[PDB]
A paper describes a structure:
OGA is the unique enzyme responsible for O-GlcNAc hydrolysis from a large number of cytoplasmic and nuclear proteins. Recently, our group and others have independently identified crystallizable constructs of OGA that comprise the catalytic domain and stalk domain, and published the apo form structures and enzyme complexes with active site inhibitors. These reports consistently showed that OGA formed an unusual arm-in-arm homodimer, where the catalytic domain of one monomer covered by the stalk domain of the sister monomer to create a potential substrate-binding cleft. Exploiting our previously reported construct of OGAcryst (residues 60–704 with the unstructured insert residues 401–552 replaced by a glycine–serine (GS) linker), we solved the structures of a mutant OGAcryst-D175N (catalytically impaired but retaining the ability to bind substrate) in apo form and in complex with each of four synthetic glycopeptides.
In the substrate complexes, all the glycopeptides were bound in the OGA substrate-binding cleft. Particularly, the GlcNAc moieties were anchored by the same set of OGA residues in the catalytic pocket, displaying nearly identical binding conformations regardless of the glycosylated residues or the flanking peptide sequences. Consistent with the O-GlcNAc hydrolysis mechanism, the catalytic residue D174 was optimally positioned to make a hydrogen bond with the N-acetyl group of GlcNAc in all the complexed structures. The N175 mutant side chain played an important role in anchoring the glycosylated hydroxyl of serine or threonine and stabilizing the OGA substrate complexes. In addition to these common features, peptide specific interactions have also been detected. As an example, the α-crystallin B chain was stabilized in a V shape by a pair of hydrogen bonds between the peptide backbone and the N175 residue. The hydroxyl groups of threonine (+ 1 subsite) and serine (+ 2 subsite) were further stabilized by intra-molecular hydrogen bonds, while the aliphatic side chain of leucine (+ 3 subsite) made favorable van der Waals contacts with L141 on the inner surface of the substrate-binding cleft. We find that OGA is able to bind peptide substrates in different directions, but in a conserved conformation regardless of the glycosylation site or flanking sequences.
Residue numbers in the entry:
A (entry chain C): 59 to 335, 373 to 391, 552 to 590, 604 to 673, 677 to 694
B (entry chain D): 40 to 44
C (entry chain A): 59 to 333, 374 to 398, 553 to 592, 604 to 661, 679 to 696
The structure:
């Protein structure tokens, strides 16, 4: 029973129940099976993990777990005690069970314990009862695994959860060594690629990992995550993941953009590649965008451009990269006559962005507009300044009026000023 | 690093 | 009477009904009176302005107008049709009245017509019927005024709604002269000052504008508006407007940050000004705000933190002192990295503690019970936190696709 779908596992405003219904309905339209609930800043998941859901909070979770069954999406509930749990103290252990008990009674069969991003050493109390840090986590993870009547799916996210993060390397890591050998065969292990946000997942890297973990690990995929850069959004295709991986993995859960409606392409393209076990990113994209266009006035070309302007954490799209070379060329070669020719076609490429913004803002699906509004606005106003600059470079053989004739000319606020001082 | 503290 | 309150008048996601109602509570609590409903991207306000409210929308809107009255806050309903409306066509004009009427039966008794940020020239059909651009708008505004029974509050917003937007200057403008002379004595005129986002609104500029429109304007203030930059938020005090503007004005309506919860300082201090020292009003506003951040209740964020937040996200032309200071200190360190007397080590230390306090601010803010406030400010506080972290460690050394595509063009512009 191979696990594929979404983890809502980012920092920030989490999604609301209504968005997660529409999420389930979408996972089913496209044949995915799983949803891991793990949003970092829903306070009871992490910051106040010992605290029980209030009465109305409970009503919400149950109505959520319901619509999960109603759509036959499997619902895994995560908890993150990492920050401040004392592993050796039995009152601590017991609060975790009491909490996991409460959610069990909401309808929840599937569970997860995450331990990403915690201060790597322990308290004075813990360093006695336990040999190493990795000992403590596995002891509690196992203990818990038992208690719940050893549930069907059950995930464990290690502190060392990607290649970069392994000390000193993947292969001969005390932490990783301990996990593979001590942590129960019925417990899955989440893994994130070579890096936190992996450009690509080599088949040799995962085979490598399966070495020390003694399992086919579950991928927490950070490819379309945007919680770490305010300006950034990711409407590109699922890519850099070999089709040959499906055999070798227990699953992939995609950790996608915070803006819910932006995640169409991210989930669709995950879904097409779930099938097929090459697979073609360029084509999956073409499919997703044509199907996506049905929801929205805007042309397919607009969406093609939009996805190109916000593509992937390591790659711009065709039209976006082309605009970049073109402006780079133009700025470089100032002053027989290809410049005027190329500045004219570039001034037109900019206008197509203005066009895409106009059509999006006149569109009928307002939930989609609002989620992306500030992203499209930023790009349009930048191109508009870029266009206006190319004109300035050109109308310069007959003027020496400098490039300013209003605070949207000097961007970024304080953060922007600090950034321009770093190399 | 994803985060901490 | 003099109008002081908020205009929901920005591009982007509009506030929801449960947020607007909360706005009403706070306007009353702080003894403000007015709310101008103008959200640019709430369709049916501008884009599909012709289209009338559904059965369910009608219920929502009415409930809201009720709550305005319940809270002794004047509700002014604005409509922005001037995008593609044909002025002479009576099909459009009758479609306008019918739109206005429908909200009237929602309980609404005050109105506005907005003609801001729209092409200077008309179609040929209207180039016939009307002499200049001004003439066209005045004509239709006046009609809808009478059509509705010449109501107590009626607002009109020019296309030349600020100093720089006037042809060729304010005093001698064709357009302003036609509005001033021919727009009905009972309608009020919106004005944002010298610029779209006026750093100051000096008295003389208001004397200059009042002369040509022959009335005292209503200030649509963009001092705290943040719709125009992804990375900007303004939590500084109402500043740059002399209290002697009040005799010379019919109102100030503030057009504040998009994130609802970030508007606490911006609205509190405008109120404070309405009854002035920006620094003292910030202290008053931050002190009261602190009470809205709790620790969550458990069955198993300080004033200094707020001040650091405000100073980091302050006003559109000025950083708060703590912000400005860190920026000063970092510049001095970066300059004298060659020097590794070593007063530098002593100063790098106090800088690293300053950076420390930014992280601390974020950690505590993320524990607080009021998650509406946390969510609204998250991505801003996160951003400053990540940068100060990298600044801290680069200071100690003595992101290629950062900002995405937009960022990459922005680094090629030279104004940066
Ligand atoms: C670390 O980083 C990702 C992307 O910023 C964030 O969403 C996630 O919550 C953190 N943990 C894991 C296992 O990815
Ligand atoms: C122009 O600028 C402000 C800030 O961008 C925008 O919110 C407002 O809707 C526009 N109109 C007016 C009258 O300011």
């Amino acid at each position: 029973h191979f696990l594929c779908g979404v983890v809502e596992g980012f920092y920030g405003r989490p999604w609301v129940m209504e968005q997660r219904k529409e999420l389930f309905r979408r996972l089913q339209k496209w044949e995915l099976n799983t949803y891991l609930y793990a949003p970092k800043d829903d306070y009871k998941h992490r910051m106040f993990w010992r605290e029980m859901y209030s009465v109305e909070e409970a009503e919400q979770l149950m109505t959520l777990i319901s619509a999960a069954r109603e759509y036959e999406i499997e619902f895994i509930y995560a908890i993150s005690p990492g920050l401040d749990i004392t592993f050796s103290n039995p009152k601590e252990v017991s609060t975790l069970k009491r909490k996991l008990d409460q959610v069990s009674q909401f309808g929840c069969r599937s569970f997860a314990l995450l331990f990403d991003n915690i201060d790597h050493n322990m308290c004075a109390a813990d360093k006695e009862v336990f040999s190493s840090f990795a000992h403590a986590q596995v002891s509690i993870t196992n203990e818990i695994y038992q208690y719940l009547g050893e549930p069907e799916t059950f995930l464990f996210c290690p502190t060392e959860y990607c290649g970069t993060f392994c000390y000193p390397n993947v292969s001969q890591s005390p932490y990783l060594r301990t996990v593979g050998e001590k942590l129960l065969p019925g417990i899955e292990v989440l893994w994130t690629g070579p890096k936190v946000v992996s450009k690509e997942i080599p088949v040799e890297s995962i085979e490598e990992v399966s070495k020390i973990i003694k399992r086919a690990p579950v991928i927490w995929d950070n490819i379309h995550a945007n919680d770490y850069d305010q300006k950034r959004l990711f409407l590109g295709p699922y890519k850099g993941r070999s089709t040959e991986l499906i055999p070798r993995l227990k699953g992939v859960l995609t950790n996608p953009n915070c803006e819910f409606e932006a995640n169409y392409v991210a989930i669709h393209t995950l879904a097409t590649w779930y099938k097929s076990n090459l697979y073609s990113p360029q084509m999956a994209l073409k499919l997703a965008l044509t199907e996506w266009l049905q929801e929205f006035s805007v042309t397919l070309e607009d969406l093609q451009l939009l996805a190109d302007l916000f593509y992937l954490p390591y790659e711009h799209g065709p039209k976006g990269a082309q605009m970049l070379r073109e402006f780079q060329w133009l700025r470089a070669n100032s002053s027989i006559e290809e410049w005027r020719s190329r500045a004219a076609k570039f001034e037109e490429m900019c206008g197509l962005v203005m066009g895409m913004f106009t059509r999006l803002s006149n569109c009928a699906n307002r939930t989609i507009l609002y989620d992306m509004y500030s992203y499209v606005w930023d790009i349009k106003s930048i191109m508009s300044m870029v266009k206006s600059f190319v004109q300035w470079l050109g109308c310069r053989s007959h003027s020496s009026a400098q490039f300013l004739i209003e605070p949207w000319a000097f961007r970024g606020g304080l953060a922007g000023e600090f950034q321009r001082l770093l190399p | 690093t994803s985060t901490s503290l």
